[PDB]
Structure 1
Amino acid sequence: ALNEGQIVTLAVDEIIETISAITPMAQKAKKYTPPAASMQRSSNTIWMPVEQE
């Protein structure tokens, strides 16, 4: 043969998925939004009451 043509390189753009993780605990831990007046990185301590006895 000896077809000494011109060589190329081909990188196809289909991905090989490797990572598939689950997060069960964060989907059960309930989310909260703190009622804070000003947006400050200062101590964000929000106090909430506890059920009375």
Structure 2
Amino acid sequence: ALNEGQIVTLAVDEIIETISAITPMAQKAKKYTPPAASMQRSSNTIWMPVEQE
């Protein structure tokens, strides 16, 4: 028989992909970026009017 040094190999190239998550709600909801310079002086707040009745 052949008795020799043993090694432990790891295959960094082959990764066992396990998880795949979808994010539809964050894609449907709209994104807005108010001007940062005005946001800083306000408390990071914008006020929007509501439709009048």
Unaligned runs of 5+ in 2: none
User: How many aligned positions are there?
Assistant: 53
TM-score (norm 2): 0.61
Superposition RMSD in Å: 2.8
Taking CA–CA contacts closer than 8 Å with sequence separation of 6 or more, which of the two structures ends up with the larger relative contact order? 1
TM-score (norm 1): 0.61
Unaligned runs of 5+ in 1: none
Runs of 4+ in 1 over 6 A off after TM superposition: none
Matched-pair identity in %: 100
Q: Which has the higher helix share?
A: 2
